[PDB]
């Protein structure tokens, strides 16, 4: 079974690129990181920025996660990210997303030790 940190790494980092290069982005990125397997993931957020930037936001400002849960962090910096949902046209197979990069605060849950991101709640 994957360990939740490294389930996070693979749902939700691109330190890679410093930013969506096109709007086929989400299509190769979604197909790429496994989340169209069985099914089309319907929504998935990638971070353009350092694994160490992103695990760092486990010490930043402590907030609530939209679930109620208190062990949610919104970084204190915008970061570059790009935010992959499914378009009407996309059924499974044939998965198809809109790829939309925006420039935003992350808040992720975080859980362990190390404590390290494990969930990606929201952007703002
Ligand atoms: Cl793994
Ligand atoms: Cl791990
Ligand atoms: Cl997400
Ligand atoms: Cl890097």
Known sequence: ?????????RQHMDSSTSAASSSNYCNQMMKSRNLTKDRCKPVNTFVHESLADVQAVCSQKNVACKNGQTNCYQSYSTMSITDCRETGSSKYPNCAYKTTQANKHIIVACEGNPYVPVHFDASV
């Not at 079974?1 to 790494?9: G, I, N, V």
Request: aromatic residues 12%; charged residues 45%.
């Open 1 to 9: 079974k994957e360990t939740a940190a490294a389930k996070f790494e």
